[PDB]
Design a protein around this nucleic acid. Sequence first.
RNA 1: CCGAGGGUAGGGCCCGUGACUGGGGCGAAGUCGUAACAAGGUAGCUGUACCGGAAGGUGCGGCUGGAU
RNA 2: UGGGAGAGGGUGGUGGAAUUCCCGGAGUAGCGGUGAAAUGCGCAGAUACCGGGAGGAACGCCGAUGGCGAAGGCAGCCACCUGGUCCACCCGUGACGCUGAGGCGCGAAAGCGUGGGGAGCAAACCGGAUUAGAUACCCGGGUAGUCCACGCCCUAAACG
RNA 3: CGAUGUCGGCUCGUCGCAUCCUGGGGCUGAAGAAGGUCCCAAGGGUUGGGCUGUUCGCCCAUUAAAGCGGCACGCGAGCUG
RNA 4: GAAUGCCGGCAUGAGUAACGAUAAAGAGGGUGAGAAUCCCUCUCGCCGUAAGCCCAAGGGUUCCUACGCAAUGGUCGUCAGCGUAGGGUUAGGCGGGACCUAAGGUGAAGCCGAAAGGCGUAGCCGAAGGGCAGCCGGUUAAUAUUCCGGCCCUUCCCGCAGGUGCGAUGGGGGGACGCUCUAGGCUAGGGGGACCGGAGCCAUGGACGAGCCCGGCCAGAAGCGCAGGGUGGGAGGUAGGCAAAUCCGCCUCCCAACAAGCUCUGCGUGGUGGGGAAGCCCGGGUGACAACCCCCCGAAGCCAGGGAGCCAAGAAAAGCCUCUAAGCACAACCUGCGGGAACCCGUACCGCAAACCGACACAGGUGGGCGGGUGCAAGAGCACUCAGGCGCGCGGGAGAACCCUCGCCAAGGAACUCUGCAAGUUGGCCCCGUAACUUCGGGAGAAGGGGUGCUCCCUGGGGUGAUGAGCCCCGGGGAGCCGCAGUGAACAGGCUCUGGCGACUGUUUACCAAAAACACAGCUCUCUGCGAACUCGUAAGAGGAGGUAUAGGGAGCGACGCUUGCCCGGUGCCGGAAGGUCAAGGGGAGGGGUGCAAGCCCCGAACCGAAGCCCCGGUGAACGGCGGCCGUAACUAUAACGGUCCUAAGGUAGCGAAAUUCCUUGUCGGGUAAGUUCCGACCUGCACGAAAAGCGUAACGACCGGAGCGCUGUCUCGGCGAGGGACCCGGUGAAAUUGAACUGGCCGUGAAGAUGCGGCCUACCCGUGGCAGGACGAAAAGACCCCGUGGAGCUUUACUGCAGCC
RNA 5: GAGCUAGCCCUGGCCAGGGUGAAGCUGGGGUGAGACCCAGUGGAGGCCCGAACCGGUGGGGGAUGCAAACCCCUCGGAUGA
RNA 6: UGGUUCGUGGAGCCAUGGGGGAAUCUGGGCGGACCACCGCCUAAGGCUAAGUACUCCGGGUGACCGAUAGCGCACCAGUAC
Lengths: 48, 275
Amino acid sequence: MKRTWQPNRRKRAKTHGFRARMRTPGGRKVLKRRRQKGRWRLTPAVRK
Amino acid sequence: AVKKFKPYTPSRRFMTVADFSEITKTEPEKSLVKPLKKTGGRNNQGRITVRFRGGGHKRLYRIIDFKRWDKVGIPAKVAAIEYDPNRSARIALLHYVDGEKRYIIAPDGLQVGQQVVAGPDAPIQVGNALPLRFIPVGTVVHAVELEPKKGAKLARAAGTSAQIQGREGDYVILRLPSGELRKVHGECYATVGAVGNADHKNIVLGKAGRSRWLGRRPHVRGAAMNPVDHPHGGGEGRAPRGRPPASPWGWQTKGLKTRKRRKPSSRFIIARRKK
RNA sequence: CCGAGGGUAGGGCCCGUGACUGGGGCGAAGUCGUAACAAGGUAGCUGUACCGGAAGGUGCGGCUGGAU
RNA sequence: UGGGAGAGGGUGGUGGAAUUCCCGGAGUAGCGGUGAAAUGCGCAGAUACCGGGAGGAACGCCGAUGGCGAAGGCAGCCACCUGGUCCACCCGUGACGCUGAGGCGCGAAAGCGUGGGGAGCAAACCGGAUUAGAUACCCGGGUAGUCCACGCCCUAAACG
RNA sequence: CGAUGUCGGCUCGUCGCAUCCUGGGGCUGAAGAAGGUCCCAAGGGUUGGGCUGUUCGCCCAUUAAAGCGGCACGCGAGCUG
RNA sequence: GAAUGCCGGCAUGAGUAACGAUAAAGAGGGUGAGAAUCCCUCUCGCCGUAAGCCCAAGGGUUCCUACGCAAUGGUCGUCAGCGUAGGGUUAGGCGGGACCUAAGGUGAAGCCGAAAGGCGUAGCCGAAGGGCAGCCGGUUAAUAUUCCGGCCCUUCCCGCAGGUGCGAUGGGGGGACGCUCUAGGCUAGGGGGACCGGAGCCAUGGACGAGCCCGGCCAGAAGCGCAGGGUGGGAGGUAGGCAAAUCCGCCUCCCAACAAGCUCUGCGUGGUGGGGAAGCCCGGGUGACAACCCCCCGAAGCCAGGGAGCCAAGAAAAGCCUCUAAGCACAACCUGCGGGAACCCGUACCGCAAACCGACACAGGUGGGCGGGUGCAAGAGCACUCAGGCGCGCGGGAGAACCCUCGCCAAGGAACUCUGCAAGUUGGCCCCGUAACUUCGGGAGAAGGGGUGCUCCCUGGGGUGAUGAGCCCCGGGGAGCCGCAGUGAACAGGCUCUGGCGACUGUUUACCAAAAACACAGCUCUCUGCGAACUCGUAAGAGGAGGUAUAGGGAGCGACGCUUGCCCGGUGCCGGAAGGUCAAGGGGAGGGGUGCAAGCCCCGAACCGAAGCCCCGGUGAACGGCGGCCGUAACUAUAACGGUCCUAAGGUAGCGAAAUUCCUUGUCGGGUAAGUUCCGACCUGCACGAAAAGCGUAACGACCGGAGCGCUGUCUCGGCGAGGGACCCGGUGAAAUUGAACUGGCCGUGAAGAUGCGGCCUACCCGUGGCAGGACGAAAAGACCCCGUGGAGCUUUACUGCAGCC
RNA sequence: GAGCUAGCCCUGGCCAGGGUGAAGCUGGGGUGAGACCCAGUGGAGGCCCGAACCGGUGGGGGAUGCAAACCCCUCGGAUGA
RNA sequence: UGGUUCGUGGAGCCAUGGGGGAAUCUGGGCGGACCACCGCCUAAGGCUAAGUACUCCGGGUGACCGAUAGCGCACCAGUAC
Ligand SMILES: [Mg+2]
Ligand SMILES: [Mg+2]
Ligand SMILES: [Mg+2]
Ligand SMILES: [Mg+2]
Ligand SMILES: [Mg+2]
Ligand SMILES: [Mg+2]
Ligand SMILES: [Mg+2]
Ligand SMILES: [Mg+2]
Ligand SMILES: [Mg+2]
Ligand SMILES: [Mg+2]
Ligand SMILES: [Mg+2]
Ligand SMILES: [Mg+2]
Ligand SMILES: [Mg+2]
Ligand SMILES: [Mg+2]
Ligand SMILES: [Mg+2]
Ligand SMILES: [Mg+2]
Ligand SMILES: [Mg+2]
Ligand SMILES: [Mg+2]
Ligand SMILES: [Mg+2]
Ligand SMILES: [Mg+2]
Ligand SMILES: [Mg+2]
Ligand SMILES: [Mg+2]
Ligand SMILES: [Mg+2]
Ligand SMILES: [Mg+2]
Ligand SMILES: [Mg+2]
Ligand SMILES: [Mg+2]
Ligand SMILES: [Mg+2]
Ligand SMILES: [Mg+2]
Ligand SMILES: [Mg+2]
Ligand SMILES: [Mg+2]
Ligand SMILES: [Mg+2]
Ligand SMILES: [Mg+2]
Ligand SMILES: [Mg+2]
Ligand SMILES: [Mg+2]
Ligand SMILES: [Mg+2]
Ligand SMILES: [Mg+2]
Ligand SMILES: [Mg+2]
Ligand SMILES: [Mg+2]
Ligand SMILES: [Mg+2]
Ligand SMILES: [Mg+2]
Ligand SMILES: [Mg+2]
Ligand SMILES: [Mg+2]
Ligand SMILES: [Mg+2]
Ligand SMILES: [Mg+2]
Ligand SMILES: [Mg+2]
Ligand SMILES: [Mg+2]
Ligand SMILES: [Mg+2]
Ligand SMILES: [Mg+2]
Ligand SMILES: [Mg+2]
Ligand SMILES: [Mg+2]
Ligand SMILES: [Mg+2]
Ligand SMILES: [Mg+2]
Ligand SMILES: [Mg+2]
Ligand SMILES: [Mg+2]
Ligand SMILES: [Mg+2]
Ligand SMILES: [Mg+2]
Ligand SMILES: [Mg+2]
Ligand SMILES: [Mg+2]
Ligand SMILES: [Mg+2]
Ligand SMILES: [Mg+2]
Ligand SMILES: [Mg+2]
Ligand SMILES: [Mg+2]
Ligand SMILES: [Mg+2]
Ligand SMILES: [Mg+2]
Ligand SMILES: [Mg+2]
Ligand SMILES: [Mg+2]
Ligand SMILES: [Mg+2]
Ligand SMILES: [Mg+2]
Ligand SMILES: [Mg+2]
Ligand SMILES: [Mg+2]
Ligand SMILES: [Mg+2]
Ligand SMILES: [Mg+2]
Ligand SMILES: [Mg+2]
Ligand SMILES: [Mg+2]
Ligand SMILES: [Mg+2]
Ligand SMILES: [Mg+2]
Ligand SMILES: [Mg+2]
Ligand SMILES: [Mg+2]
Ligand SMILES: [Mg+2]
Ligand SMILES: [Mg+2]
Ligand SMILES: [Mg+2]
Ligand SMILES: [Mg+2]
Ligand SMILES: [Mg+2]
Ligand SMILES: [Mg+2]
Ligand SMILES: [Mg+2]
Ligand SMILES: [Mg+2]
Ligand SMILES: [Mg+2]
Ligand SMILES: [Mg+2]
Ligand SMILES: [Mg+2]
Ligand SMILES: [Mg+2]
Ligand SMILES: [Mg+2]
Ligand SMILES: [Mg+2]
Ligand SMILES: [Mg+2]
Ligand SMILES: [Mg+2]
Ligand SMILES: [Mg+2]
Ligand SMILES: [Mg+2]
Ligand SMILES: [Mg+2]
Ligand SMILES: [Mg+2]
Ligand SMILES: [Mg+2]
Ligand SMILES: [Mg+2]
Ligand SMILES: [Mg+2]
Ligand SMILES: [Mg+2]
Ligand SMILES: [Mg+2]
Ligand SMILES: [Mg+2]
Ligand SMILES: [Mg+2]
Ligand SMILES: [Mg+2]
Ligand SMILES: [Mg+2]
Ligand SMILES: [Mg+2]
Ligand SMILES: [Mg+2]
Ligand SMILES: [Mg+2]
Ligand SMILES: [Mg+2]
Ligand SMILES: [Mg+2]
Ligand SMILES: [Mg+2]
Ligand SMILES: [Mg+2]
Ligand SMILES: [Mg+2]
Ligand SMILES: [Mg+2]
Ligand SMILES: [Mg+2]
Ligand SMILES: [Mg+2]
Ligand SMILES: [Mg+2]
Ligand SMILES: [Mg+2]
Ligand SMILES: [Mg+2]
Ligand SMILES: [Mg+2]
Ligand SMILES: [Mg+2]
Ligand SMILES: [Mg+2]
Ligand SMILES: [Mg+2]
Ligand SMILES: [Mg+2]
Ligand SMILES: [Mg+2]
Ligand SMILES: [Mg+2]
Ligand SMILES: [Mg+2]
Ligand SMILES: [Mg+2]
Ligand SMILES: [Mg+2]
Ligand SMILES: [Mg+2]
Ligand SMILES: [Mg+2]
Ligand SMILES: [Mg+2]
Ligand SMILES: [Mg+2]
Ligand SMILES: [Mg+2]
Ligand SMILES: [Mg+2]
Ligand SMILES: [Mg+2]
Ligand SMILES: [Mg+2]
Ligand SMILES: [Mg+2]
Ligand SMILES: [Mg+2]
Ligand SMILES: [Mg+2]
Ligand SMILES: [Mg+2]
Ligand SMILES: [Mg+2]
Ligand SMILES: [Mg+2]
Ligand SMILES: [Mg+2]
Ligand SMILES: [Mg+2]
Ligand SMILES: [Mg+2]
Ligand SMILES: [Mg+2]
Ligand SMILES: [Mg+2]
Ligand SMILES: [Mg+2]
Ligand SMILES: [Mg+2]
Ligand SMILES: [Mg+2]
Ligand SMILES: [Mg+2]
Ligand SMILES: [Mg+2]
Ligand SMILES: [Mg+2]
Ligand SMILES: [Mg+2]
Ligand SMILES: [Mg+2]
Ligand SMILES: [Mg+2]
Ligand SMILES: [Mg+2]
Ligand SMILES: [Mg+2]
Ligand SMILES: [Mg+2]
Ligand SMILES: [Mg+2]
Ligand SMILES: [Mg+2]
Ligand SMILES: [Mg+2]
Ligand SMILES: [Mg+2]
Ligand SMILES: [Mg+2]
Ligand SMILES: [Mg+2]
Ligand SMILES: [Mg+2]
Ligand SMILES: [Mg+2]
Ligand SMILES: [Mg+2]
Ligand SMILES: [Mg+2]
Ligand SMILES: [Mg+2]
Ligand SMILES: [Mg+2]
Ligand SMILES: [Mg+2]
Ligand SMILES: [Mg+2]
Ligand SMILES: [Mg+2]
Ligand SMILES: [Mg+2]
Ligand SMILES: [Mg+2]
Ligand SMILES: [Mg+2]
Ligand SMILES: [Mg+2]
Ligand SMILES: [Mg+2]
Ligand SMILES: [Mg+2]
Ligand SMILES: [Mg+2]
Ligand SMILES: [Mg+2]
Ligand SMILES: [Mg+2]
Ligand SMILES: [Mg+2]
Ligand SMILES: [Mg+2]
Ligand SMILES: [Mg+2]
Ligand SMILES: [Mg+2]
Ligand SMILES: [Mg+2]
Ligand SMILES: [Mg+2]
Ligand SMILES: [Mg+2]
Ligand SMILES: [Mg+2]
Ligand SMILES: [Mg+2]
Ligand SMILES: [Mg+2]
Ligand SMILES: [Mg+2]
Ligand SMILES: [Mg+2]
Ligand SMILES: [Mg+2]
Ligand SMILES: [Mg+2]
Ligand SMILES: [Mg+2]
Ligand SMILES: [Mg+2]
Ligand SMILES: [Mg+2]
Ligand SMILES: [Mg+2]
Ligand SMILES: [Mg+2]
Ligand SMILES: [Mg+2]
Ligand SMILES: [Mg+2]
Ligand SMILES: [Mg+2]
Ligand SMILES: [Mg+2]
Ligand SMILES: [Mg+2]
Ligand SMILES: [Mg+2]
Ligand SMILES: [Mg+2]
Ligand SMILES: [Mg+2]
Ligand SMILES: [Mg+2]
Ligand SMILES: [Mg+2]
Ligand SMILES: [Mg+2]
Ligand SMILES: [Mg+2]
Ligand SMILES: [Mg+2]
Ligand SMILES: [Mg+2]
Ligand SMILES: [Mg+2]
Ligand SMILES: [Mg+2]
Ligand SMILES: [Mg+2]
Ligand SMILES: [Mg+2]
Ligand SMILES: [Mg+2]
Ligand SMILES: [Mg+2]
Ligand SMILES: [Mg+2]
Ligand SMILES: [Mg+2]
Ligand SMILES: [Mg+2]
Ligand SMILES: [Mg+2]
Ligand SMILES: [Mg+2]
Ligand SMILES: [Mg+2]
């Protein structure tokens, strides 16, 4: 049956995207942490 | 008249529609329609603030002239009477001799081809706008401004009307459709006559589907809920209210007056609604 | 082929009968009240409506077959 | 053809009196009600009086033993649309008539449906008295209804 | 109680005998036939339905008889639910 | 040495279950160290509204080719969506961008918020919507509307010529719209042809035939033809379309008018460019100078912005046209022609699936288009089959129990059982014919029954032709033939009587409840006069509503029919400007501290002083309530009646052993041979009752009861048969569980149910297929129960607060 | 965190075929006119049968599954809330 | 109301959301309600090194670890998943 993952590249980008993150004080701080952790990709890679 | 249907289906049995015989044109004036942004009950927060709404038939807001003193002395020919889905009432398409076309809430007894006019000097005839101070006392009137130059507010719904009961200084005394006796400013425009389509109230929807067409989504009794939801929630099996009957928000829904007491407009309200 | 009739199925009328139920007639030596006949002690009757242990009462309109 | 009387009917208007209610003014120890009372109303200011507003219903005097209609019925007043009927002329038609099983229409009040309207009145109902009891009569309240539009209902001491 | 699944039904049995039947008897207010009552006896047998979830019971038609109990009110790593 | 400890390794179960749809396989030939599994041929089966083809998501090299088989592949492997390497994605016209707007998002102005931030008409962003210029064929191992070929076309720049008041983000027009039904004429697609083309074939008894088999088109500017869409013309006036206006709107006259005209699109033809089968031969050659036509069927697609009807009344903006404004008129725009210019991104391959979402090459999920033929009334249904694609990534055997799915069955026909659960029966279409009841629609496919194939003969109406042949469609009437059987296979109601609940179609516990529950039209209370009430928010702002009492919010009830009684003491709500109480504050008699003093400081009575409560009254479709004892009638029984106590007032109508009745399987009647159920009554209703509505009600129901008919393996009562497992052999090979084990019965004993203690009895060692009584078997640190001064959700006249309102 | 799920908003798309035959319209009958009746036309509906599609009624299978909700048969809605 | 040890306490002091509202030294604040006395200080403007906190980085040193330890990572680790 229909499951929880229904990939959509626009939805993925317009939600967890870098521009979404930087728009919000919570999101900006997410990037801070991920960067501080040394994480290789601060934002979900998506194929545009 | 109100059209009745033969019961060839369970819900056709009680379903009744309007007669639509007063209607002359079946298309809206393109010049005068704008798209209606549907709200679905929700506000700018996205939050439902009025419940059980949405999914109504797509409708197109016909711009109505509630000022009408916008064109004093300038007459107009009643060109057509049209359907307006945005209101209980019917609308009339006025071809002003100025060339300008406008919509007004069609009064009861209007005529395709009759001419009307707004102004103090205007006759006391159907569909004519005047300030109240020039309208004869006792004459029935509709579409009344509440304050000067603020647009018609009172008596706009189908069949509704107000009657002048006398004057007192700058103000006059109106009997609003509710039955409330209120002081309206004498310089407020009103249109002699009563709103047409008086048969509106005698319409039986007939089915659950028709309510949906009107954007009215199903209502849920407080009693049919749980304690987290409604004050009337819970109870094993059915149950009486078990408290004073209340809204979902707790406030009492039987008899409790909610109009603000120190409201400045109290000075101009004589007698509260009756019945 | 038709055909007495037999068979399956479904209707219509009439008769007997039926837990129980409704009111009716007669019985009288019972209990309850006293509605009508006199102005019957609130004039009566009537169609209708509602109501009451019961007769009845009351409303609305009608008749005199109402005393004075 | 020429007249006439009349609450005959339908619709739209409009006029005064009175009751109730609301606001104002003035005034105070009771008002009300009955066979007598009580319930009720009244110093939280009633009743009685004056001014004003809202609203509904019914139309005093004329009014009469009267008029009209087939009956039910119909009453302040104006206009409109409309029926029946009586009189004179003796002019036209030339028996074209009377009656009427069925049929159709009308049909007081009460009652019903949808919607308005609601002052007075008032089934139901509540209370006060009377009573042996009083699910009545009398008294203070009071809901349908009484009123309008529309459709039913089709009864009567619808009687001369 | 770091779990010993519960009524009744179905299936499959097996056991006790305080025996319902059949077998052997004593007494009888046992003439006969049919019973009553106690004794010995567990080998085998102990039907089909109606009602109710029912066990139980009542009822129908039979029968030699339509026994009563134990086995975690036998049996859900066998079924039903 | 233990913590159901943590991390790792390795055991057990065990050569065990399984190896993923029962659509299916066999042989021959090649390759290779190795072949059931890779390649080739033949034979067989499966899908064919797909299991075929094409899009869009998503995936991201999986594409093609060469070389490989450690691992991945549920087996094998020489093969592969796997490993290595190389190659492959070509656009002014397809899609998106350099165009437009939708919700929404963002947001100059502005508003708000302790900060972070929240809003906000315009503008901008935003598309699978509007707009917009490419069709046919050929070519590669792999791309093509992209390369090539032919035939067409758009925009931009420049120039030429002719034309004109040119000129805009400004004005107007247009773009611009629903649902259902639908006309005319075409196209797509399809069927037939005795006509045209074609390699061939004559078998096995017949056929050299109007024989069989195969094919008989595609695109194409201008012009023309057919079919449709769009659209009135001229003048005069003009005060409106926030400037201007010759445009638009409005008024008037004159013509035109269901036409014509002008214009746009579709289809046909169209110069020209292509394609072109079966068979045969080693993807290509051939067929072939291929033929390329006629008749019929015909769309849901095109003409289209067509028509009609209906109510629930059906986007925007740009492109486009027109109007003018600054400006500018040797400029500009328009029209034709010519030359030049035309960028970015995508393009492979999967795409109902082994490449997407499901940890898997997972019997699941995934939007749009195409989806042929014949037969069955029709159709996308069903059976077969074309094209195309597959036989499902372990096999070979055996022919036990048992399980699954399926077939049949003597006599009986529900005796089964909680229940006809299940399985039978019934089954499409044409005709005949259909009851109570009813809201007159229905109930109704009621019920029940007759017909159903084929052959010959006769005749009727339609469509396309022409009015005829031919084709196709819809019939009618005779007379015959065969079988057990004619919707001969597949797809396709069992029916009736009667009660409860709910009016009804709908909705719901995603993953144990689809119901009587929720919703529902409808009814009634109630709040709200508009900056509405109410809701969200600290606010701004929103929703309500661009609505205005025939409206909007809240509550209850729940189509409809007939109805909805009595109690206002208490609670709630509404009204009451008296009275009583009541906080801050006003007031300051009086009293105090301190100072030598004026002074400073402090306590402080009467008195005034809101809402709220008290208080007076109203209110039930507001929260709610709606008694008891005793006496009494020509026999008994009973109580119309009376008496009394209590109450705020003591249940009205209707209904009642009921979705309610404890006693209870109440009593009586019905049905049955027998009825704790069911239906009808009765009423001492433990403990119905009138909008938490009362009582009924046609129709409706995968709701829950009762009965009968029909038919049945449900049963008496089981038997046989089929396939997939189970079993055997080859390949691969788990799992929970597991203190260690050399793990028997009885009777006892033992923490009270012993393989493990005692006494007996019995017992050679080890397996395999089977059954489940025991190991208080496995699983889950019992959901029940209790306990903990454990935790949560919910309630209130518990406490104490806060928002909110006064 | 609304790529599952709930509701709403914008913009698109889908629902083979068959059956029933409301209003209306026309013609006729009827009447003072009517109401109304009758035939033909017409094509309404939370209308009927039934695919796609949306469901999830009963049974069986499955239960270390093909599957952390599947499979077979049966059944509901299918122009509409 | 907050701050201070100060929870309304006899509650001053410092700060201030509301209302009232001065004076310039003969001004004013304070020394724990208040009054006197004796004293201390000069509010409603601003700036100011050093001594102090921390350790991304660099270095030195360990009765610190020695690959289940020591940082999550000694290894291409905030990676694979
Ligand atoms: Mg789905
Ligand atoms: Mg996941
Ligand atoms: Mg996307
Ligand atoms: Mg997208
Ligand atoms: Mg890096
Ligand atoms: Mg109709
Ligand atoms: Mg019906
Ligand atoms: Mg109508
Ligand atoms: Mg339209
Ligand atoms: Mg529009
Ligand atoms: Mg527009
Ligand atoms: Mg917004
Ligand atoms: Mg938001
Ligand atoms: Mg009208
Ligand atoms: Mg209404
Ligand atoms: Mg109504
Ligand atoms: Mg509603
Ligand atoms: Mg509701
Ligand atoms: Mg609930
Ligand atoms: Mg909640
Ligand atoms: Mg609550
Ligand atoms: Mg409750
Ligand atoms: Mg609950
Ligand atoms: Mg409840
Ligand atoms: Mg209850
Ligand atoms: Mg005002
Ligand atoms: Mg008497
Ligand atoms: Mg009397
Ligand atoms: Mg009398
Ligand atoms: Mg009595
Ligand atoms: Mg009375
Ligand atoms: Mg008189
Ligand atoms: Mg007379
Ligand atoms: Mg004469
Ligand atoms: Mg003569
Ligand atoms: Mg009458
Ligand atoms: Mg009357
Ligand atoms: Mg009384
Ligand atoms: Mg008495
Ligand atoms: Mg009275
Ligand atoms: Mg008389
Ligand atoms: Mg336990
Ligand atoms: Mg013995
Ligand atoms: Mg003896
Ligand atoms: Mg004897
Ligand atoms: Mg003997
Ligand atoms: Mg003995
Ligand atoms: Mg024995
Ligand atoms: Mg034995
Ligand atoms: Mg025995
Ligand atoms: Mg039974
Ligand atoms: Mg015997
Ligand atoms: Mg015993
Ligand atoms: Mg026991
Ligand atoms: Mg047991
Ligand atoms: Mg037992
Ligand atoms: Mg079990
Ligand atoms: Mg059991
Ligand atoms: Mg069950
Ligand atoms: Mg159960
Ligand atoms: Mg561990
Ligand atoms: Mg083996
Ligand atoms: Mg084993
Ligand atoms: Mg085995
Ligand atoms: Mg095996
Ligand atoms: Mg399997
Ligand atoms: Mg199968
Ligand atoms: Mg197989
Ligand atoms: Mg097969
Ligand atoms: Mg070989
Ligand atoms: Mg096919
Ligand atoms: Mg590759
Ligand atoms: Mg490949
Ligand atoms: Mg390998
Ligand atoms: Mg190898
Ligand atoms: Mg290798
Ligand atoms: Mg392998
Ligand atoms: Mg696998
Ligand atoms: Mg590869
Ligand atoms: Mg090109
Ligand atoms: Mg483009
Ligand atoms: Mg550019
Ligand atoms: Mg753009
Ligand atoms: Mg914003
Ligand atoms: Mg700003
Ligand atoms: Mg686009
Ligand atoms: Mg394009
Ligand atoms: Mg091509
Ligand atoms: Mg290529
Ligand atoms: Mg020009
Ligand atoms: Mg110009
Ligand atoms: Mg323009
Ligand atoms: Mg057509
Ligand atoms: Mg073509
Ligand atoms: Mg031969
Ligand atoms: Mg063709
Ligand atoms: Mg003018
Ligand atoms: Mg202008
Ligand atoms: Mg001009
Ligand atoms: Mg052509
Ligand atoms: Mg060729
Ligand atoms: Mg050649
Ligand atoms: Mg040749
Ligand atoms: Mg040739
Ligand atoms: Mg044709
Ligand atoms: Mg169609
Ligand atoms: Mg159209
Ligand atoms: Mg724009
Ligand atoms: Mg100029
Ligand atoms: Mg560029
Ligand atoms: Mg490509
Ligand atoms: Mg592909
Ligand atoms: Mg699928
Ligand atoms: Mg598809
Ligand atoms: Mg495919
Ligand atoms: Mg594949
Ligand atoms: Mg997959
Ligand atoms: Mg994978
Ligand atoms: Mg596979
Ligand atoms: Mg799959
Ligand atoms: Mg699908
Ligand atoms: Mg068929
Ligand atoms: Mg089907
Ligand atoms: Mg099929
Ligand atoms: Mg096939
Ligand atoms: Mg397989
Ligand atoms: Mg049989
Ligand atoms: Mg039988
Ligand atoms: Mg039975
Ligand atoms: Mg069944
Ligand atoms: Mg069949
Ligand atoms: Mg019958
Ligand atoms: Mg039939
Ligand atoms: Mg044959
Ligand atoms: Mg069928
Ligand atoms: Mg019952
Ligand atoms: Mg229901
Ligand atoms: Mg349903
Ligand atoms: Mg569920
Ligand atoms: Mg759940
Ligand atoms: Mg669901
Ligand atoms: Mg779950
Ligand atoms: Mg669940
Ligand atoms: Mg259901
Ligand atoms: Mg109702
Ligand atoms: Mg607003
Ligand atoms: Mg608003
Ligand atoms: Mg608005
Ligand atoms: Mg309810
Ligand atoms: Mg009360
Ligand atoms: Mg009260
Ligand atoms: Mg009271
Ligand atoms: Mg009282
Ligand atoms: Mg109050
Ligand atoms: Mg006083
Ligand atoms: Mg003093
Ligand atoms: Mg002192
Ligand atoms: Mg007060
Ligand atoms: Mg009540
Ligand atoms: Mg109470
Ligand atoms: Mg007696
Ligand atoms: Mg009673
Ligand atoms: Mg009974
Ligand atoms: Mg009860
Ligand atoms: Mg009990
Ligand atoms: Mg009982
Ligand atoms: Mg008994
Ligand atoms: Mg009997
Ligand atoms: Mg039962
Ligand atoms: Mg009964
Ligand atoms: Mg009894
Ligand atoms: Mg009840
Ligand atoms: Mg109640
Ligand atoms: Mg009932
Ligand atoms: Mg009825
Ligand atoms: Mg019923
Ligand atoms: Mg159901
Ligand atoms: Mg069997
Ligand atoms: Mg077999
Ligand atoms: Mg074997
Ligand atoms: Mg013991
Ligand atoms: Mg024991
Ligand atoms: Mg033992
Ligand atoms: Mg030992
Ligand atoms: Mg065992
Ligand atoms: Mg087993
Ligand atoms: Mg053991
Ligand atoms: Mg066990
Ligand atoms: Mg266990
Ligand atoms: Mg478990
Ligand atoms: Mg634990
Ligand atoms: Mg525990
Ligand atoms: Mg639980
Ligand atoms: Mg405690
Ligand atoms: Mg304790
Ligand atoms: Mg606690
Ligand atoms: Mg708690
Ligand atoms: Mg708030
Ligand atoms: Mg409030
Ligand atoms: Mg969603
Ligand atoms: Mg489709
Ligand atoms: Mg259809
Ligand atoms: Mg029509
Ligand atoms: Mg239809
Ligand atoms: Mg339907
Ligand atoms: Mg259906
Ligand atoms: Mg299912
Ligand atoms: Mg279910
Ligand atoms: Mg089966
Ligand atoms: Mg499961
Ligand atoms: Mg179905
Ligand atoms: Mg439906
Ligand atoms: Mg819709
Ligand atoms: Mg403090
Ligand atoms: Mg203290
Ligand atoms: Mg302090
Ligand atoms: Mg301050
Ligand atoms: Mg000093
Ligand atoms: Mg200070
Ligand atoms: Mg001090
Ligand atoms: Mg001191
Ligand atoms: Mg200073
Ligand atoms: Mg500093
Ligand atoms: Mg220094
Ligand atoms: Mg420093
Ligand atoms: Mg270092
Ligand atoms: Mg070392
Ligand atoms: Mg290591
Ligand atoms: Mg480590
Ligand atoms: Mg080591
Ligand atoms: Mg580590």
